[PDB]
């Protein structure tokens, strides 16, 4: 039965280390992201929750009738 | 109304939806809602009644009135800073006048008693076109103001839009008045999680058109409005009534269906933002939504109605048009959960 | 003779089918979590000299 | 509550850009795929049960688009999915590595050194 | 994992293209074949347990209930068959199709690594058991019932929906393994009471515990003879087995926090074994009769001791398979009668010997008779109790005399006396429900051989 | 919610009259023409978030 | 006395009265848009007293 | 406004109950002024006088229902020498649900009102022990 | 009419021995229920009880107690044959443990 049906303890002991590695690196990679999240939304110098301002290129400097501005 | 009219005035209030959603100056954006008003204003009075004219009556008055309210808060935005564009609002007091207006055109509560009075008086037709299309442009809006928002206002809205759309849909036998209220708490559990992420709110705005397109379908071809009318489909059309039934399920929120999702996504979210209690309130309050599918589906599909004798020559006739999107957007309303990661798409 | 009986017990084969399906899935999923194999500190070992891998 | 759309050099409406390329394509078996080919299926069956059809032998030719047009799109959809989290793990590395002090390496102790606290079962 | 979820998959379309005389064949038979293959995962490692991927796992837990599952299926198509026979073919093939969606959800439940899954399918678990009941109960009240069902389930499980995302959130992980290996203590404090009630009281009501307990005998009274079956051998089980889960990440807490459930559930089995005694409905006795034992459950899975969950699992297999038993047997006579009443149908013994016999051996279980796998269980909790407080035993041994009493009682009731004068459409019972009735006790006392099968991982 | 098609267009449909600073008819200024152009381009491209402080 | 009265009555019965009771309270709404719009006016004046000094 | 809300907190718990009892029949006066007014708009009272009826008792009922919260509160807190205890809160809770059974006279609502007000006022003072929000802001 | 609505009366049962005196209980068809019959017995008491329980009877000992008696054995004839204890209060090396320097 053991020979036609299972295998050895080895495989299922080192396919639970694996899983584990696996699950053990996503939890650290999410609470890693939640802090990320957390500093870029309280200080906005990151990529994240760039919201948008006025694009400097709409401004005309040309003179204005009037030497100031 | 001449066909050709009919499709003007669609694609002028399509037309009025999309300048509000590709506007970058405040001026274009209250254009895009005048131009979607004066189009829609047509479209519920095609069949002639008076309760359609009461019902287009009341929609003009409440459109109106937050137009104004919408016009004077970007005007005291400007007055407090000259600035045209839709970024973020300068004035807490003309924040708070943005919120109003967008809520009052939303039918966020209280401003909710128009919605069902204006889904009654009405076509399906109409009725579909209300309650799916003319949410995206305020939710649009929102969401582009979203950083402003004052999270205490818009919260309170929202879980008094729930409550609400709980409790009134509880009482009704008319179907266009459950969907209503549906909407009305729907609208809530979106403008939930819209202060915390907008992604989310796109994603509860998407799966929310799916169904009641999906069930606005199904109700134009068994053409019931009531209750008792719809009782009599099965003895005609029993795959349109077992389908009804899995959709209602799907509108519970019920897992493994489709509608179990937002619902699911936003709580995780607002746990995220340490937001433990209000979650848990509103999924105990949508449980009144539940109920009354449920009482829907009890009289619908689970148990056969009594039935007349004049259905035996309806039985010899096919339908003779025929709605395209309607087996997509059944598969979709039911059928999506699996497919959850792929709303990092939506951002 | 066999054509009629086949088109009406078809339907016996879709369960095995499913079930042979199933244990290779099984076999390709053991597949992905081959990080570990004979890297334990308790089954780390020495291949024999014509074996490649330690369990498969 | 919009962390993603003000990104810099971020194209409007492309829907897939040119740095989504450095990535792998999903693979054409996909159970991803064969799943929005799946919902394809249940599209066309649902469509032959209302029109009042034969629900499996009906409409091949409809049945076969369907399941094409659900899997094509599901393909584009999966690789907007996977560029998007590409582009989530890159920034949070980029933010980790350029804020050292605010994601601080302290030394760990073996448990042997670590007081835990016994609480007996009775 | 997949040898057995696509084959239960494969059932579907098997059964929608087979030919409407041949889907009870069809099903049964290769329900029967899905069970033998299931069968297989009962080989457990010992120290730990069998992690297939990184979705599913199999434990000595989850194996007795796994194998249970997949047995009850066939034993519901051999008793549905009977009272489905006037159906159309398309409602038949709907009524396979929903037991076998139920089948795929239990199966699935059971082995899932990861705590949102498990929620997402322990919750997909009540739709198809809501159209069964709603749709092919037999009576008017099945609208109440479920409604009943639906809501009371709800209630108890969104809390714990909120307090799994906020765990995740807190912890990076909801994975068993990570969650087993990484616990730490919980405080005493509001927040942490109230993250113990929200991961506690689903799987309180499922069980059910007494005081929440008043849907279960109108959903297990008013479902078909299937839904009845599923209803008390697997469904009630969940709960369970959510608590052994769960209440890994809740010490040190549960040492308070289980004070008033424990009192609940010990004068509540007191209290459902004395409403046993007058009970003028034959389904209803069965119905508190589970209630009573799943208190005993309850009990068992507070006091955390080896010796409870052992005996606590022995205790959830044995009154499935017995619980099931009971209601087959029950609905046997209302086929013949056409009621529910107990005093309606009376020396049934005179008439029907071999249902007699099927009777008295599944009257002997339900009071667990030694050396029966249902006295194991329920020895194991009461020496665990004993442990727990030397006052409990008054208790047990007041409702093991109760829990006889009303056993005694039933059998007596239908069995004994003389027959219904008036009844004369007794016909002799057929070879389907004695293969059933067999089907059901065979395994019962095949188990006592090899007990340790069903006593959980902590043998 | 915001498509933006003049940017990918570079059609300029609204823009023009989006900020006092930005080509009036006859070179006429804006009596705060100096403060805002100051302003905007402290602002340009740091985000919402820090532009405010 | 337990399971047929008083269980029934705190937990179902309880829920089921409160929820007809409030379903009443707040579907039963005469239609008249003159209501409405004078309960919009005092939403309106909240918002602005109770929200809008609050910042 | 939370003004109210902040005179009320403003005080510490077990001191100075007269000054308690007074800010939390405020808050009560508000609220039931607000529902007076809300339940004349949706519902006319076909008169004057009436309408000032109804504003006089349900704004009558709202103001002695915190008033015997906010006093017994306090004086059980200072009594029992336990701040910080959601207990104080619970039986505040249930006299003000007493109150108003007793106002509306129907022993069910009083019950009722006692027991949910309480475990309401409960859930309040440990929100406050432990930094619960509702309105959370959005930190992440 | 005095009648509330147009119902078919409600049937009474039919005796499946009435038109087969063996029916098995399983179908109405002789053939189909005779097949039923067998086909149950064969998967159920042939194939599911006996096999099922042959195979679960001589399951190999994955769960480690023969290997645990042999390595306890082992263990007990080691310690008592130098004079050890059988066993330690300790189940790990206090050399290997840091407890906190000071207690007050
Ligand atoms: C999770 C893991 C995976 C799970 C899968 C998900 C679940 C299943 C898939 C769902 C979608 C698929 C089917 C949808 C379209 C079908 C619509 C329909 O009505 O069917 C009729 C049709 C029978 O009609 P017919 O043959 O044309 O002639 C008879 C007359 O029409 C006579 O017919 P009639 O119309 O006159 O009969 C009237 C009847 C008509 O009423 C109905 O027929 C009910 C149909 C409801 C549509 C389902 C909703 C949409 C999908 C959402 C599913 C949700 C699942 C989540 C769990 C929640 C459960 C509700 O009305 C009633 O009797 C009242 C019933 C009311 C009771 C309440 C229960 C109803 C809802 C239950 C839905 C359960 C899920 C679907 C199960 C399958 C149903 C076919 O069914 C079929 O024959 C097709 C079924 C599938 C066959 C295709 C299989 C492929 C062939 C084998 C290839 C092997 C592939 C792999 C290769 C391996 C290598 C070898
Ligand atoms: C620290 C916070 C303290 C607590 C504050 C928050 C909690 C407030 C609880 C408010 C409870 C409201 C529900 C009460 C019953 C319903 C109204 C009613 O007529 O009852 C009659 C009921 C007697 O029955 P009845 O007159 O024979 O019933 C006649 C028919 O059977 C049936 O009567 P009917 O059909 O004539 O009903 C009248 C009518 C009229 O309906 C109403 O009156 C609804 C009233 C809602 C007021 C909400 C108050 C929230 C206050 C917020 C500001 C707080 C500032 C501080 O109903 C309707 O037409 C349908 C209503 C639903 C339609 C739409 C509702 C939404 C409108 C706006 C809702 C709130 C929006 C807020 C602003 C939103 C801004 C975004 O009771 C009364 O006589 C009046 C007394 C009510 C109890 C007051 C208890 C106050 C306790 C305060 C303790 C403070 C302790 C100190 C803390 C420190
Ligand atoms: C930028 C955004 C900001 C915008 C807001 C700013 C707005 C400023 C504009 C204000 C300038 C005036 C403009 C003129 C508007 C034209 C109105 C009109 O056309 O009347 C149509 C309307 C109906 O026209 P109709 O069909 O020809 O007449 C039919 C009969 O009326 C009905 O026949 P019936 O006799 O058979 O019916 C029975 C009787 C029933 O009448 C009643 O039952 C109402 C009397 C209740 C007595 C209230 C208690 C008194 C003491 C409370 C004081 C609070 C502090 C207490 C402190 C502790 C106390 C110890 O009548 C009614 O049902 C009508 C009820 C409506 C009463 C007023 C509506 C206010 C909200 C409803 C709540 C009622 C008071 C509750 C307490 C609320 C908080 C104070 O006429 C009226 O109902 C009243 C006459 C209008 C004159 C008063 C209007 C002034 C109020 C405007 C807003 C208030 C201040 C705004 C800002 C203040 C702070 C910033
Ligand atoms: C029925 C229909 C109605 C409903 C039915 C309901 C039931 C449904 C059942 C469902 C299916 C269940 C499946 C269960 C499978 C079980 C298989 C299993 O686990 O087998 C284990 C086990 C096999 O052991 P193993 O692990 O293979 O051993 C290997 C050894 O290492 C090495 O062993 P070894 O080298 O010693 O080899 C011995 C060898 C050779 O031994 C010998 O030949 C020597 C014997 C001594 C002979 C000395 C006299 C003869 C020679 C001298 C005379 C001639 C020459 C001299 C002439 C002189 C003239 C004056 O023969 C044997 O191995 C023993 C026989 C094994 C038979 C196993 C049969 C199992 C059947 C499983 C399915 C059953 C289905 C039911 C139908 C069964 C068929 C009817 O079988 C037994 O346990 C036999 C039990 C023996 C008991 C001995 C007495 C104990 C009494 C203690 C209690 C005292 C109080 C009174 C109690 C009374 C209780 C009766
Ligand atoms: C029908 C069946 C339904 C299901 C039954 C569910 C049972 C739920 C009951 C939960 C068990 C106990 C809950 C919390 C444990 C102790 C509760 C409290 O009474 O203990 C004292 C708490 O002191 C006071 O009593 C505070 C609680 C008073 C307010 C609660 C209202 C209770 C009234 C009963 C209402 C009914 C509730 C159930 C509704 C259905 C302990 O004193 P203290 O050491 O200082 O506080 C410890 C907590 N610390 C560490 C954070 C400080
Ligand atoms: C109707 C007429 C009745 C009269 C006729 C009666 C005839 C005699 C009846 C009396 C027979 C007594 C038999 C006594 C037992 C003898 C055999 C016994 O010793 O074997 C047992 C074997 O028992 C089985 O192992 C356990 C039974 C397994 C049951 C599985 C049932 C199949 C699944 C069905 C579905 C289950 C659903 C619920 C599951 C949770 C114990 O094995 P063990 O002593 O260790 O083995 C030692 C040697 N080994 C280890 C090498 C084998
Ligand atoms: C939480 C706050 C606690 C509020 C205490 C009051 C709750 C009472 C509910 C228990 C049931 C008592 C009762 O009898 O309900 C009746 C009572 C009305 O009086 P009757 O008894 O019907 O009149 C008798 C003659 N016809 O019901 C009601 O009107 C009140 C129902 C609403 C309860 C409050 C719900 C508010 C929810 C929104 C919160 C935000
Ligand atoms: C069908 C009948 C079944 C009924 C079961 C209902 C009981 C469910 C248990 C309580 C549900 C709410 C639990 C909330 C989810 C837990 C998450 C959590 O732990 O967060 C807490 C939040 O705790 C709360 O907010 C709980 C407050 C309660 C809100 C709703 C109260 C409703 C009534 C509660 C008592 C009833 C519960 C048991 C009754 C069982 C059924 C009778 C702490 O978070 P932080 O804010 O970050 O604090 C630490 C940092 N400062």
């Given at each position: 039965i053991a020979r036609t049906f299972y295998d050895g303890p080895e495989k299922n002991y080192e396919k639970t280390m694996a899983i584990l590695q696996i699950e053990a690196e996503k939890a650290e990679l999410r609470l890693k992201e939640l802090e990320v999240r957390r500093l870029m939304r309280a200080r906005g110098d990151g990529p994240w929750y760039q919201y948008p301002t006025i694009d400097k290129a709409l401004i005309d400097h040309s003179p204005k009738t009037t030497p100031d501005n | 109304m001449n066909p050709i009219i009919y499709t003007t005035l669609i694609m002028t209030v399509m037309s009025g939806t999309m300048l509000v959603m590709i506007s970058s100056h405040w001026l274009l954006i209250w254009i895009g809602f005048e131009m979607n008003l004066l189009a829609m204003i047509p479209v519920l009075m095609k069949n002639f009644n008076p309760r359609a004219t009461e019902a287009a009556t009341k929609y003009f008055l409440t459109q109106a009135t937050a137009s104004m309210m919408l016009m004077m808060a970007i005007i005291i935005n400007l007055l407090y800073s000259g600035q045209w564009t839709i970024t973020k609002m300068f004035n807490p007091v003309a924040m708070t006048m943005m919120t109003m207006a967008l809520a009052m055109k939303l039918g966020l509560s209280p401003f909710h008693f128009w919605v069902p009075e204006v889904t009654q008086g009405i076509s399906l037709q109409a009725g579909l076109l209300l309650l799916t299309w003319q949410k995206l442009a305020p939710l649009s809006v929102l969401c582009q103001i979203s950083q402003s928002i004052n999270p205490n206002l818009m919260l309170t809205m929202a879980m008094l839009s729930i409550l609400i759309g709980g409790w009134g849909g509880l009482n009704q036998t008319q179907l266009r008045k459950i969907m209503a209220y549906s909407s009305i708490a729907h609208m809530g559990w979106m403008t939930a999680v819209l202060p915390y992420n907008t992604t989310m709110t796109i994603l509860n705005l998407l799966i929310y058109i799916t169904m009641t397109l999906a069930m606005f379908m199904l109700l134009i071809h068994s053409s019931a409005t009531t209750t008792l009318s719809l009782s009599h489909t099965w003895n005609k059309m029993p795959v349109i009534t077992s389908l009804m039934m899995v959709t209602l399920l799907s509108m519970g929120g019920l897992p493994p269906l489709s509608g179990f999702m937002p619902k699911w996504m936003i709580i995780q979210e607002m746990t995220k933002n340490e937001s433990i209690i209000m979650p848990t309130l509103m999924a105990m309050t949508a449980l009144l939504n539940l109920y009354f599918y449920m009482r829907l589906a009890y009289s619908s599909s689970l148990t056969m109605f009594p039935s007349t004798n004049n259905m035996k020559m309806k039985w010899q006739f096919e339908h003779t048009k025929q709605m395209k999107l309607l087996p997509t957007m059944i598969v979709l309303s039911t059928l999506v959960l699996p497919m959850t990661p792929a709303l990092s798409s939506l951002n | 003779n066999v054509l009629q009986i086949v088109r009406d017990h078809w339907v016996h084969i879709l369960v095995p089918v499913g079930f042979v399906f199933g244990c290779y899935l099984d076999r390709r999923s053991d597949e992905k979590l081959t990080a570990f194999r004979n890297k334990s500190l308790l089954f780390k070992r020495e291949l024999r000299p014509n074996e490649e891998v330690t369990w498969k | 509550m919009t962390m993603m759309s003000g990104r810099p050099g971020r194209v409007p409406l492309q829907f897939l850009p040119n740095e989504a390329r450095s990535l792998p394509p999903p693979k054409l078996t996909d159970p991803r795929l064969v799943y929005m080919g799946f919902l394809g299926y249940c599209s066309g069956l649902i469509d032959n049960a209302i029109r009042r059809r034969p629900v499996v032998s009906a409409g091949l030719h409809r049945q076969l688009l369907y399941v094409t047009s659900f899997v094509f799109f599901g393909y584009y959809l999966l690789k907007r999915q996977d560029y998007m989290y590409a582009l989530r793990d890159h920034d949070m590395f980029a933010y980790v590595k350029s804020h050292p002090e605010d994601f601080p390496e302290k030394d760990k102790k073996t448990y042997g050194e670590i007081l835990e606290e016994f609480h007996p079962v009775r | 994992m997949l040898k057995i979820i696509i084959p239960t998959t494969m059932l579907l379309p098997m059964t929608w293209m087979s030919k409407h005389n041949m889907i009870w064949i069809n099903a049964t038979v290769h329900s029967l074949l899905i069970s033998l293959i299931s069968?297989?995962?009962?080989?457990?490692?010992?120290?730990?347990?069998?992690?297939?991927?990184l979705t599913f796992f199999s434990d000595s837990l989850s194996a007795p209930l796994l194998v249970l599952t997949t047995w009850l299926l066939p034993l519901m198509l051999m008793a549905s068959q009977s009272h489905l026979s006037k159906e159309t073919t398309t409602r038949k093939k709907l009524y396979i199709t929903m037991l076998i969606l139920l089948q795929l959800f239990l199966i699935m439940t059971f082995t899932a690594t990861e705590l949102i899954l498990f929620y997402i399918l322990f919750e997909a678990t009540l739709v198809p058991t809501l159209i069964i009941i709603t749709r092919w109960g037999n009576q008017t009240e099945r609208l109440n019932a479920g409604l009943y069902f639906l809501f009371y389930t709800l209630a108890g499980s969104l809390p714990l929906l909120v307090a799994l995302v906020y765990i995740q959130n807190t912890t990076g992980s909801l994975n068993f393994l990570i969650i087993h290996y990484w616990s730490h203590p919980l405080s005493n404090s509001w927040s942490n009471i109230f993250m113990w009630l929200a991961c506690i009281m689903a799987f309180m009501v499922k069980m059910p515990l007494y005081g929440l307990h008043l849907w279960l005998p109108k959903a297990h009274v008013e479902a078909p003879i299937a839904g009845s079956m599923v209803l008390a051998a697997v469904l009630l089980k969940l709960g369970g087995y959510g608590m052994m889960r769960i209440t890994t990440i809740l010490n040190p807490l549960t040492n308070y926090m289980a004070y008033p459930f424990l009192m609940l559930s010990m004068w509540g089995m007191i209290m459902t074994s004395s409403i046993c005694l007058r009970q003028t409905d034959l389904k209803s006795l069965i119905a508190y009769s589970s209630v009573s034992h799943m208190a005993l459950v309850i009990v068992a899975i507070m006091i955390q001791t080896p010796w409870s969950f052992m005996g606590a699992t022995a205790l959830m297999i044995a009154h499935g398979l017995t619980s099931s038993m009971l209601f087959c047997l029950a609905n046997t006579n209302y086929e013949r009668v056409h009621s529910r009443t107990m005093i309606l149908a009376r020396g049934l013994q005179t008439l029907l010997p071999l249902m007699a016999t099927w009777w008295l051996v599944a009257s002997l279980t339900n009071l667990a008779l030694p050396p029966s796998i249902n006295l194991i269980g329920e020895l194991f909790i009461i020496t665990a109790s004993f442990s727990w407080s030397n006052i409990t035993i008054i208790l047990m041994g007041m409702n093991m005399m109760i829990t006889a009493l009303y056993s005694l009682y039933m059998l007596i009731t239908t069995q004994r006396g003389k027959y219904t004068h008036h009844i004369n459409n007794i016909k002799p019972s057929f070879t389907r429900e004695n293969a059933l009735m067999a089907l059901h006790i065979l395994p019962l006392l095949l188990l006592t051989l090899n007990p340790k099968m069903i006593l959980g991982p902590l043998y | 919610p915001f498509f933006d098609v003049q940017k990918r267009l570079g059609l300029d449909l609204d823009r023009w009259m989006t900020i006092q600073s930005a080509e009036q008819p006859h070179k006429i200024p804006g009596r705060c023409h100096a403060f805002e152009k100051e302003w905007i381009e402290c602002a340009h491209g740091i985000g919402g978030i820090r532009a405010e402080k | 006395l337990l399971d047929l009265i008083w269980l029934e009555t705190i937990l179902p019965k309880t829920t089921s009265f409160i929820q007809m009771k409030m379903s009443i309270m707040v579907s039963?709404?005469?239609?008249?848009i003159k209501l409405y719009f004078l309960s919009f006016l005092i939403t309106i004046m909240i918002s602005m007293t109770l929200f809008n000094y609050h910042e | 406004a939370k003004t109210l809300l902040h005179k009320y907190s403003d005080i510490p718990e077990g001191t100075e109950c007269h000054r308690k009892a007074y800010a939390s029949t405020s808050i009560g006066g508000a609220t039931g002024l607000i529902v007076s007014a809300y339940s004349i708009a949706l519902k006319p009272p076909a008169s004057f006088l009436e309408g000032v009826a109804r504003t006089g008792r349900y704004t009558f009922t709202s103001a002695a229902i915190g008033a015997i919260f906010g006093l017994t509160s306090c004086i059980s807190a200072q009594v029992r020498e336990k701040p910080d205890d959601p207990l104080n809160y619970f039986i505040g809770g249930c006299a003000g649900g007493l109150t108003l059974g007793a106002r509306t006279r129907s022993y069910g609502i009083g019950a009722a009102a006692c027991a949910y007000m309480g475990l309401t006022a409960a859930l309040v003072k440990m929100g406050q022990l432990e930094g619960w929000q509702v309105f959370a802001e959005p930190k992440v | 009419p005095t009648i509330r609505l147009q119902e078919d009366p409600d049937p009474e049962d039919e005796n499946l021995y009435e038109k087969n005196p063996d029916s098995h209980g399983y179908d109405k068809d002789p053939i189909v229920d005779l097949w039923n019959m067998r086909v149950v017995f064969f998967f159920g008491?042939?194939?599911?009880?006996v096999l099922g329980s042959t195979f679960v009877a001589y399951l190999p000992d994955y769960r480690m107690q023969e290997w645990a008696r042999r390595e306890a054995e082992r263990l007990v004839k080691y310690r008592e044959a130098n004079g050890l204890p059988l066993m330690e209060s300790n189940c790990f090396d206090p050399n290997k443990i840091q407890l906190p320097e000071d207690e007050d």
């Open positions: - | - | - | - | 069968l297989s995962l009962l080989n457990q490692l010992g120290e730990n347990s069998l992690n297939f991927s | - | 039963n709404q005469k239609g008249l | - | 008491f042939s194939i599911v009880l």
